[PDB]
Amino acid sequence: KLSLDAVPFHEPIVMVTIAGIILGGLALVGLITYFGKWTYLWKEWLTSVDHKRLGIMYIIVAIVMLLRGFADAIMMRSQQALASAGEAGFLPPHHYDQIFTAHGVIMIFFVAMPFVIGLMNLVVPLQIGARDVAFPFLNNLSFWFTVVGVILVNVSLGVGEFAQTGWLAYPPLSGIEYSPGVGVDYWIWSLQLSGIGTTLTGINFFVTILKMRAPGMTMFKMPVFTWASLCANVLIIASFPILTVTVALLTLDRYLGTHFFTNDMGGNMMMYINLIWAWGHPEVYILILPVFGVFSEIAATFSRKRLFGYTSLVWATVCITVLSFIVWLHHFFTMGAGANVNAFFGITTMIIAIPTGVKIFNWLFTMYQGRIVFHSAMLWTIGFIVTFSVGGMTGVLLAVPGADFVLHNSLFLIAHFHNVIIGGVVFGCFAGMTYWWPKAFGFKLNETWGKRAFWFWIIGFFVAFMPLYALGFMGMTRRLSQQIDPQFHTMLMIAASGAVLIALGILCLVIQMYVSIRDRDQNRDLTGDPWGGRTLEWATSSPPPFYNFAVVPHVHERDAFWEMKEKGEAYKKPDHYEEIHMPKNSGAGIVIAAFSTIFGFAMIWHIWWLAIVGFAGMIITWIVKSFDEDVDYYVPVAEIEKLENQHFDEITKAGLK
Amino acid sequence: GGTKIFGFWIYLMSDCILFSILFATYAVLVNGTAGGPTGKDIFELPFVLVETFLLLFSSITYGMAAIAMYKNNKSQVISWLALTWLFGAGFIGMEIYEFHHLIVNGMGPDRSGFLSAFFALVGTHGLHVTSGLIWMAVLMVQIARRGLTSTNRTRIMCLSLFWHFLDVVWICVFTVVYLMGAM
Amino acid sequence: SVKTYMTGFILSIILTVIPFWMVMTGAASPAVILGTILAMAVVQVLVHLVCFLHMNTKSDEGWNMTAFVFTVLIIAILVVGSIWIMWNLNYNMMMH
Amino acid sequence: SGCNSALLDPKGQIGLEQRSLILTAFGLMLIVVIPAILMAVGFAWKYRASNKDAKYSPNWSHSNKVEAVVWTVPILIIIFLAVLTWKTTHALEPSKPLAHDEKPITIEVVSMDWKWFFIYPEQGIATVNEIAFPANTPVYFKVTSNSVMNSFFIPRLGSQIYAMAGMQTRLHLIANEPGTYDGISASYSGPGFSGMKFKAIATPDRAAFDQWVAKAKQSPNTMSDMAAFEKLAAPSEYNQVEYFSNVKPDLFADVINKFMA
């Protein structure tokens, strides 16, 4: 029995063109991989326990989902432009609601989160001088759980719908009685599986940073990006359980007819808003803390100057981590709590703003009296300081409950959080991508197209969300689809131009990637240390070896690689390379996530037999992987010798040292 | 080596957060009874006492298994692990008995918000204990097949952390929901 | 550790029985009962941690006492804040 | 930030106080944000890398004066903001009775599928997607929901308070000037959420409000029973203004008790 599946996919509406082009494009890659390398794509990628390849795959998934999230953004902006001035838009309400809920879910969970997790996966083991993450198979399984969530969300665009409830699915509207459709089930199961993956990767990175640091690198000689990653993983471990429990309770309400959040049989629908934001704000700092680290490096790297407030930045990040769990209620001020609770949580939300300001001034004083080379990443850093200051200012303006009563769900809130994400996580992920592109692929991204993309992005964002600040001051609320007030038409037609400019920016980024890959043989980062460098990640070949360090660095100082370059002990060939122990690539994750894609989908549609054979499949593949014993290999000294000789001869072909 | 044990400890901290969220939900919805059971009329505290004794016995037998794992004795480790699994299976079957008795009557999770929260918290602890029992069965099979090898000693320590953490969670459960439920 | 585990067994049995007997047989005001059951639960949790889990400050170069302290601080923040927020809401959600 | 926008040109006392709070917070955060952006661009050009006249001082990490200032001034700003926030939160709490001489006009608001329902309990009126009340007269909104969570928001008057099924929230709003003020649902509720737009006619005086009440009393249909409320509660997106002469004496209480049982 196929159960609730049936065969209305999207036939009444024209969204089967996109479903038609996502299966055609798949066919294209199905041909392209056929006309080329398939065993490479399985042996090296798609089964890797290497943090670098898994981070690259995370970022690839993040970019791919960024294209669909931005398509949703363009459709929403054109729908709001058309609905204002009177004309009925090309999106009915039932589809516009799916579109904004999927934009929020894809962007928070499948664009912003995978991009940050991929940057951390690619960089953190290199910075701490570690060969690999603490739990490599758990990192592969976390990546493939994120892929399971991506696949479930994309399939929601095909068979069935996605939730028409908002990206957090508030409980009364997302209940089984008011949302009988399968959209909230897609939301629930993609989020549950992505949350499992994110929690596992938080455990992986927390343990990697705490335990697998290089000998001699104390915790305050650690790179600042690693500090930000450690704090973000603390937030992941202490928050994503909240999301898991909340979505599990919603699952029980929608499947077993329980009454956690129903409004009738003793259920308290406000407790979901308390819980979903109990994780909501920590996962908002899960996104912004690593990119802070991304700018703590890119500044100190592109100012030719030691990062100013290392202790101040570290303690500000720790304070942000501690305080992110005491601010949640600032997301439902208007729910009706007393003046004491609203005032207390507004005070804590304004208190959690001093560390971020200290970090901003630490970066702009790291630029003080430095050699600022305006590389693309440095432009992204200046843009981040400029726009993130505005976004945080507006957020603190919202942090006061009195202002939030009149600005709770206006377009001013939309402008706030898009200012702090686009000018935050998005700017920091593009900055990190350009900064560490040589440390992942060997090539260097085309700086011309990178600057073009940065300018388009910043200008388009500014000319697309400042109108939303004005609309928030005009009283326009979130998620309006049809018959907008024509009073709002001008600002929405200025925000449409900004969305078009951000489209041009994403196009410039795509062109940048294409030209960099086409011009790969030029700008080949021979030395494996472009744009100066101040951390251990730059003490390796531009594509790092699979072990990424023949001899673990000793890291006597804080800015290890810069100190090694100044001291002259930068590139030393060791007397002997010992055999080193590496984890072996394991495809079990694929299987512990293939049955995760089944189980979720067979749970979204009430296919109980297939959900049981997907859950049993996951658990039994986990048992089988537990029984596996040859999950490691000592790499022969010949391979290490050959790779290190190649790297050191390449250094000799430059200033040899 | 110890990295796996430390990472499982951090995951047990994540599960501490999960159980804290379920405890907050139970504390919110405890008075959310809708013309149904008030807790004091369904908890049957002798049941809770014998169940707490059973789970404490399971924890003690696992501790004996661990101290026998420090010594190089495969047989007694397996024996104590089987005893722990029997205690945990009794625990799980007794909670399935209680949940069945609630479900057959009109006092199911769908009856009221209080019963839904009770079922969430207690059945989540039950599913954790059941997953620990599946893990314990697999660990017994692997110990029998390969002995107390380095991989299995780490798994023994991780499952010890898991089992004692579940016992602590049950301490908090029987204190919060069962005892405070009956004044 | 056998002596430690048996002392934990005895302490946890005498810490589980006492609250159960207090609740079943009364013998105290319904304010002493709550205090004593909460105190016995806290002490029993501490016993299960220090004895059975072998929790010590020196293990894992810290980060095992630190991890539990931070986790229980987050548990306290989440639970207490959720209960305070939901109590204030439910009072503000009333017909009064 | 429009000059004639709803929030930065409010016609209600709560709106005026919230606008004052918004402006004060905006300026007090600007006196630290404008320096941040101005230094981000100045330090960038001045020090540059081409500029050779710059000081180029590497390895200059710690400074006690700079760190002291950067930990001092935001702390002072946030201390003032927290004091102002506590005062304005205890003054602007939606459940505060506004301390006004005039007796408040009680309106019982019930969000429905995609429409707003207003029970005037002392006037006896019922209305859909329209309210009226005397200008400079306190208005006490007892807001609840019938289907899902909404937010009873009049942008030009003040706070937006969440409407919740089975729960009565309180919102006191007073309009200092007459006129028709748009009101919306500020929380997404479903396909017809874009059509949950009502109007609030702040009548010039009690006489105009009484005339509006009489016009509503001249309505053929009533809300005498709960079946009429349920018929009205049927899903409809873009409802038109509709009046009902008399209502069940405790219809709002019964609407809430549908959920609290």
Ligand code: HEO
């Ligand atoms: C990247 C993620 C991110 C980050 C980092 C922030 C940062 C902040 N946010 Fe926002 N936000 C984010 C993303 C969101 N916020 C939200 C919602 C939200 C809400 C209300 C929710 C609602 O009404 O519905 C408030 C009040 C804030 C406030 C703040 C504050 C005070 C900060 C501060 O941390 C900003 C700190 C930075 C500052 C302040 C600028 C730097 C400092 C300078 C330049 C000088 C410093 C001096 C002083 C502070 C005195 N946020 C929502 C929910 C929207 C929705 O889904 O509906 C999202 C997604």
Ligand SMILES: CCCCCCCC/C=C/CCCCCCCC(=O)OC[C@H](COP(=O)(O)OCCN)OC(=O)CCCCCCC/C=C/CCCCCCCC
């Ligand atoms: C049809 C079956 C129905 C069952 C219904 C009851 C629920 C059962 C749930 C079982 C979940 C899985 C339990 C664990 C099985 C696997 C155990 C295992 O592999 O043990 C070893 C394994 C790996 O050891 P290594 O030495 O690193 O191995 C290296 C080589 N791979 O050890 C571990 O550390 C794994 C620990 C597993 C912990 C599992 C925790 C489960 C928590 C469940 C939470 C449920 C929350 C409530 C919601 C439930 C859904 C509504």
Ligand SMILES: CCCCCCCC/C=C\CCCCCCCC(=O)O[C@H](COC(=O)CCCCCCC/C=C/CCCCCCCC)COP(=O)(O)OCCN
């Ligand atoms: C029905 C509701 C929806 C959810 C259904 C699915 C539930 C979960 C199914 C399983 C997912 C997790 C699989 C975990 C695989 C093993 C993890 C593990 O033990 O990792 C160790 C690492 O050591 C550890 O123990 C890792 C740190 C501790 C992790 C403990 C938690 C693992 C996940 C448990 C389940 C979490 C979610 C449960 C359900 C929650 C509610 C939905 C092995 O990795 P390596 O270090 O490379 O060792 C060699 C491998 N060949």
Ligand code: HEM
């Ligand atoms: C630059 C590209 C983007 C544009 C143009 C854009 C634009 C929009 C628009 C127009 C909306 C609808 C607002 C409304 O009418 O209520 C929206 C909603 C949203 N966006 Fe974006 N967005 C972009 C990228 C992102 C990113 C990067 C994130 C975060 C990772 C994000 C998170 C959200 C969320 C959470 C919502 C609300 C979803 C909901 O209401 O359920 N967006 N965005």
Ligand SMILES: COC(=O)c1sc2ccc([N+](=O)[O-])cc2c1O
């Ligand atoms: C729930 O999601 C949706 O309803 C829709 S419609 C639509 C149309 C085009 C694209 N696109 O080009 O990526 C995406 C989507 C999308 O996600």
Ligand SMILES: [Cu+2]
């Ligand atoms: Cu927040």
